[PDB]
Design a protein around this ligand. Structure first.
Ligand SMILES: [Zn+2]
Lengths: 340, 207, 40
RNA sequence: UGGGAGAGGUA
């Protein structure tokens, strides 16, 4: 007789994004741990609380091993002969009957283990709300900064984390304002924080262009490569199979509208739009703009270019402290050399 | 997490009103060993403890401690902001002092600041929608439209601007927003960061 | 009569000797565990 | 918890 499991199934039921069998597993692990700690002998009793009755029978376990320690769980092949060799070497089934009592020490350790189980079950709730949609621009309010991370939320008691290295260098987020970020690939097994969200990745700019531009949305214009100097300067690479709509004019929009939108959403980062081409030589003479081309030596084995450049455009060709050469090399994959 | 219990413990002895008191055990902690743990956790993470006690108006002397630590942080961090990095010594010390004091008053500002509570919600930021109660029957809540949910009038950053242009007169509002105000927001983010790391070190001590 | 006459008793003998059920197996197993001795 | 009376005692 148990009206209490009936309270589990209707009266003290969970939030409805959590299954009932996990709650039954939580309570069965709770009573198993409670009878485990209470017995003075080192018995790893695992009790099978059957679902429909509520009451149960305490089950001290036994695994088929040939070791010398743990006699309370040490059964052998000749003990598996009692069930005549119909099992496996090492599974922890039982062949015993025990009883159960209650105590306030059992109550408090059961409270500890059930708040651990509902904690990891809520963690699995955030796991399935992550795995329902893989990679998108999201918005949450920052609520508690830290030394190495910025904790976030997505509503419904979810949490996300901006780490230190994947944010803007000009970040200033007082707790209480809404920020934009992209969850990319989080750890569903992480016991602490899981949802790793960035603000200074190429995935950020391409997802921002995806939500911004409808022809990125429906695959008319496509972006192939990207380049980032976070907060200051950027480059992305555009090719297009369609011949109707102007690609660069489309992604700059009406008087630099889309570029200024991503620039103010990114923090003043000068995203410099440039074409993507398939062939290496003509791709890179398209790609180092606004620098000028004298002669190009294309190298295959160590994946580099050699660029002759006339005098006058060296500063805007290299950027500031080698910014443009570095950004163009991690754009194209070919690191650049200086030639006059 | 851990820190606000110590702010409960900084009060005087309050009278109890219940039946049989005095558990007389070490169930949670005493009231003196929490202060001893605050002392043990002061050699590291003293910024956040000073800022927390100055924010919650318990031990109203470490407001100056938090302003001094913020001034030291601004002196260490001022070499990345173009508006402040070109000024001379005592003038840069005085602008760092005035924006440190205003940044700390902006961090301190909650619904208990005199003259800062919302007019309608009285700080709760949660009013009752009468139409949803009339159609649903039950009682509902909504966001207080005047305060927009936060429950208090926020501190405008232009107060520090008005208090610095009595000293730097040739600094207008666009360059204030362009190369001065990020330092101010860096100061308030540093206040929140130091309070979080002090709560973390407190929980590491009293564990 | 002795634990010196239990030490040579292999786990095959403990379950092939008559009228030693699961409860008697636990009754000898927990007392050899509390006495520290092992068997097998 | 912690307040007030009354009684006795120590230097
Ligand atoms: Zn309000």
């Amino acid at each position: 007789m148990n009206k209490e499991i009936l309270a589990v199934v209707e009266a003290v039921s969970n939030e409805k994004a959590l299954p009932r069998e996990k709650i039954f597993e939580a309570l069965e692990s709770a009573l198993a741990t409670a009878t485990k700690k209470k017995y003075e002998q080192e018995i790893d009793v695992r009790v099978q609380i059957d679902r429909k009755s509520g009451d149960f029978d305490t089950f001290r376990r036994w695994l088929v091993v040939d070791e010398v320690t743990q006699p309370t769980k040490e059964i052998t092949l000749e003990a598996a002969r009692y069930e005549d060799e119909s099992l496996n070497l090492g599974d922890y089934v039982e062949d015993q009957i025990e009883s159960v009592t209650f105590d306030r020490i059992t109550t408090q350790t059961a409270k500890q283990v059930i708040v651990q189980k509902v904690r990891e079950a809520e963690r699995a709730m955030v796991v399935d709300q992550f795995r329902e949609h893989e990679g998108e621009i999201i918005t949450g309010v920052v609520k508690k900064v830290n030394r190495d991370n910025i904790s976030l939320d997505l509503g419904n008691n979810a949490e996300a984390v901006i780490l230190r290295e994947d944010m803007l260098p000009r970040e200033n987020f007082r707790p209480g304002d809404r920020v934009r970020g992209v969850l990319y690939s989080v750890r569903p097994e992480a016991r602490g924080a899981q949802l790793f969200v960035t603000r200074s990745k190429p995935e950020m700019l391409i997802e921002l262009f995806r939500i911004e531009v409808p022809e990125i949305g429906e695959e008319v214009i496509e972006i192939k490569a990207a380049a980032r100097d976070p907060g200051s300067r950027a480059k992305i690479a555009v090719k297009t199979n369609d011949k109707r709509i102007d690609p660069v004019g489309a992604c700059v929009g009406m008087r630099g509208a889309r570029v200024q939108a991503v620039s103010t959403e990114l923090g003043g980062e000068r995203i410099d739009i440039v074409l993507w081409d398939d062939n290496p030589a003509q791709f890179v003479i398209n790609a180092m703009a606004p620098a000028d081309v004298a002669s190009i030596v294309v190298d295959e084995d160590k994946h580099t270019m050699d660029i002759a450049v006339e005098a006058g455009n060296l500063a805007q060709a290299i950027g500031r402290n080698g910014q443009n050469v570095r950004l163009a090399s991690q754009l194209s994959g070919w690191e650049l050399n200086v030639m006059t | 997490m851990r820190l606000e219990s110590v702010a409960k413990f900084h009060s005087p002895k309050s009278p109890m009103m219940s039946d049989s008191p005095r558990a007389t055990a070490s169930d949670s902690l005493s009231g003196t060993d929490v202060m001893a743990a605050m002392g043990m956790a002061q050699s590291q993470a003293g910024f956040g403890m000073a800022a927390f006690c100055g924010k919650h108006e318990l031990s109203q002397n470490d407001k100056q401690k938090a302003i001094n630590y913020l001034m030291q942080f601004a002196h260490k961090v001022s070499g990345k902001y173009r508006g402040v990095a070109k000024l001379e010594g005592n003038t840069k010390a005085k602008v760092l002092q005035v924006l440190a004091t205003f940044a700390y008053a902006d961090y301190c500002r909650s619904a208990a600041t005199p003259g800062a509570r919302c007019r309608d919600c009285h700080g709760t930021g949660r009013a009752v929608d009468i139409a949803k109660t009339e159609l649903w029957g039950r009682v509902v809540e909504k966001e207080c439209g005047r305060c927009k949910g936060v429950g208090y009038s926020r501190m405008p950053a232009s107060a520090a601007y008005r208090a610095v242009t009595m000293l730097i007169p040739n600094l207008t509002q666009p360059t204030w927003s362009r190369t001065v105000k990020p330092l101010y927001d860096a100061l308030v983010v540093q206040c929140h960061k130091e309070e979080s790391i002090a709560d973390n070190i407190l929980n590491a001590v009293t564990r | 009569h002795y634990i010196g006459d239990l030490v040579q008793r292999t786990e095959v003998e403990l379950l092939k000797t008559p009228n030693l059920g699961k409860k008697s197996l636990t009754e000898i197993k927990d007392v050899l565990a509390s006495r520290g001795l092992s068997l097998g």
